[PDB]
């Protein structure tokens, strides 16, 4: 028959042409495509479609998916589309049209007796976030990050020890082994970074062979040209990534000297703006180079009225904390000069605010600069794709794990986050790890239904014992995998190997490959791109803040 567009949106979620506001921001997304056949949408419930002989077929488990997310509005780097998502063996099987081929047309995701259903109509589904700047100061950070929508955590540490408070380093084989073992207990994918500050290659090779997927060079252990060169040489031979927190003191040289030591080799620069560490006051100029993958830590995102005040006492400090570079950073993100966002957990960063802050920056940039040159249509679709890429696919590419996670594409691990539009980026409706729900809001356990108060995040079956091990990944270096580290340490979780860390360059960062001709005035700290001044205004009030949090 016929149905009005409003009633349709209420029943199956929005379709082509409809717009949706992201939380309480000024960002609006427009459905670009819908993979359904109007009248053949699958809906679950009493008297609904997914029932024997109807939307559910007669196929054996091998010929149908284990889980189907129905009528989902996908927001990913490649598109904002309406479709059904099929999950099989813990991985993304297909994005298409679900149902039973016996009676329905265009079915690409077969639903059978072995299929569970998650009703996603009216919800936005995204890939799980990836935070590559974790300080393993405490294990509680994993739950905090998972609840925020982050499913992969890369970093280093051994607990609340001085070395870890300051740097993302898991020093040596013993601590590396202990932390790989502890990782089986956490509900997120994990990869470790070792201490890269040494001028003897073998001391680095040992760490890589022990299990680290990268080496952190931090100024607290000495970010000298000699150490930098040594770490990059080993990284080049073992296919692992190097993360850098440069010499803020300009002790061994200036930024140009560090860049010279790097010598065109691939490297991930942490908090490239500088407040979180780096050559004072021009480490930000690194985003102009093709071999530099630049990220920001979150406390400076976005520039607000209280920013400078808190940062100064949080931290010579006046040379590290600069209003000029802090304001420019937001714009550089908007232009695609900075490609990643991360936390820097409990070491000048907030572990549960990587996603939230990325969207606040997008909001503030839309409000101040308007539409991007790339925008098409009367929506913010391109800006949304540019920003979601900063905490999903780009971090995955930078660390060589994009073959496993980072986006909603077939064959990748099914790490998905379901969001109600009113709470997008703030409080997820469901967080799925490897095909199982791992954490979600849950009401009264004794209630007649799952919705009565109090509703708060509680661990689900995907976070329990052996089910957890089967739904999470521990990333290892190719050398560790070959040496049988997993068998030796008796690791219980699924294992994944990193690869392609040396070949990624700025041009590979999705929607964020700009290499601006940027300069920083040594005296005034003013940032200029092509001679023009880059700056912005501090926000007095931000979305995704006081309307959602109890404290």
């Amino acid at each position: 028959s016929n149905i009005s567009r409003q009633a349709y949106a209420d029943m199956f979620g929005p379709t082509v042409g409809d717009k949706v506001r992201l939380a309480d921001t000024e960002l609006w997304i427009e459905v670009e495509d819908d993979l359904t056949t109007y009248g053949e949408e699958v809906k679950f419930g009493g008297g609904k479609v997914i029932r024997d002989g109807m939307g559910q077929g007669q196929m054996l488990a091998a010929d149908c998916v284990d889980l189907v997310l129905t009528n989902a509005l996908i927001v990913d780097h490649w598109g904002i589309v309406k479709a059904d998502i099929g999950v099989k063996d813990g991985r993304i099987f297909a994005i298409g049209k679900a149902g039973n081929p016996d009676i329905q047309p265009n079915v690409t995701i077969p639903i059978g007796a072995a299929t569970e259903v998650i009703a996603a109509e009216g919800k936005i589904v995204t890939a799980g976030g990836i935070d590559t700047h974790i300080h393993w100061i405490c294990p509680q950070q994993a739950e905090e990050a998972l609840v925020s929508g982050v499913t992969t955590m890369v970093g280093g540490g051994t607990g609340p020890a001085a070395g870890t408070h300051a740097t993302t380093c898991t020093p040596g084989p013993w601590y590396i082994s202990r932390m790989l073992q502890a990782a089986d207990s956490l509900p997120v994918n994990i990869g470790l970074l070792g201490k890269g500050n040494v001028s003897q290659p073998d001391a680095l090779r040992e760490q890589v062979a022990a299990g680290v997927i990268g080496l952190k060079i931090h100024e607290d252990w000495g970010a000298t040209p000699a150490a930098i060169d040594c770490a990059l040489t080993v990284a080049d031979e073992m296919d692992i990534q190097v993360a850098l927190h440069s010499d803020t003191l300009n002790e061994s040289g200036f930024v140009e000297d560090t860049l010279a030591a790097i010598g065109g080799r691939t490297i991930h620069t942490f908090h490239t703006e500088g407040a979180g560490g780096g050559h004072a006051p021009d480490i930000i100029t690194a985003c102009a180079h093709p071999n530099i993958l630049p990220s920001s830590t979150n406390p400076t995102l976005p520039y607000t009225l209280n920013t400078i005040d808190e940062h100064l006492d949080m931290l010579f400090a006046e040379s590290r904390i600069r209003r000029e570079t802090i304001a420019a950073e937001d714009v550089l993100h908007d232009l695609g000069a900075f490609s990643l966002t991360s936390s820097d957990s409990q070491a000048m960063g907030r572990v549960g605010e990587v996603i939230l802050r990325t969207w606040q920056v997008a909001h503030r940039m839309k409000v101040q600069r308007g539409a991007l040159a790339e925008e098409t249509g009367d929506n913010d679709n391109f800006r949304v794709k540019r920003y979601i890429a900063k905490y999903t696919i780009n971090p995955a590419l930078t660390h060589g794990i994009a073959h496993e996670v980072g986006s909603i594409e077939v064959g990748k691990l099914a790490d998905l986050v379901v969001w109600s539009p009113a709470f997008f980026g703030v409080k997820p409706a469901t967080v799925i790890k490897g095909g199982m729900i791992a954490i979600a809001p849950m009401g009264d356990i004794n209630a007649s239904i799952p919705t009565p108060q109090p509703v708060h995040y509680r661990p689900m079956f995907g976070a329990l014992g052996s089910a957890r091990h089967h739904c999470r990944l521990t990333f290892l270096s190719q050398a560790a995998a070959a040496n049988g580290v997993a068998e030796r340490l008796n690791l219980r979780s699924a294992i994944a190997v990193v690869k392609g860390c040396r070949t990624v360059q700025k041009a590979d960062m999705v929607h964020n490959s700009l290499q601006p001709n940027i300069t920083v005035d040594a005296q005034t700290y003013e940032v200029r791109v092509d001679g023009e001044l880059i700056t912005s205004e501090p926000a007095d009030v931000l979305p995704m803040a006081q309307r959602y949090f109890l404290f």
Binding site: S199, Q200, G222, T224, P225, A226, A227, D229, L249, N250, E251, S252, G253, F254, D257, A280, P281, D282, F316, S319, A522, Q523
Partner: protein
């Protein structure tokens, strides 16, 4: 009564006693500040610092461990250096020695 209070006996501590020292006038010719730590091989500091690098070979700053000396752009000052001990083998820094001496 102050919980966990110290009762430090008055006086001073002599640092790095019995070791060769030397004074060097250093000038920052760069446009950005430079800060040097107590144990950094002085001869391999940031190139913008102008001084007799040959005299500073095998030396570090004769200041309490963990502290540093800052040089604002254009700043000129005389510092006291104390010789490295142990095996007197230098590895790291700018990669100029990478061995004994």
């Amino acid at each position: 009564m102050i919980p966990g209070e110290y009762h430090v006996k008055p006086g001073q501590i002599a640092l790095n006693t019995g070791r060769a020292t030397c004074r060097v006038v250093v000038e920052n010719h760069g446009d950005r500040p430079i800060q040097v730590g107590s144990h950094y091989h002085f001869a391999e500091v940031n190139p913008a610092l102008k001084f007799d690098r040959q005299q500073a070979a095998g030396y570090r700053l004769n200041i309490p461990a963990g502290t540093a000396v800052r040089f604002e752009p254009g700043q000129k000052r005389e510092v006291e250096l104390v010789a490295f001990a142990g095996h007197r083998a230098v590895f790291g820094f700018r990669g100029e020695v990478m061995g004994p001496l």
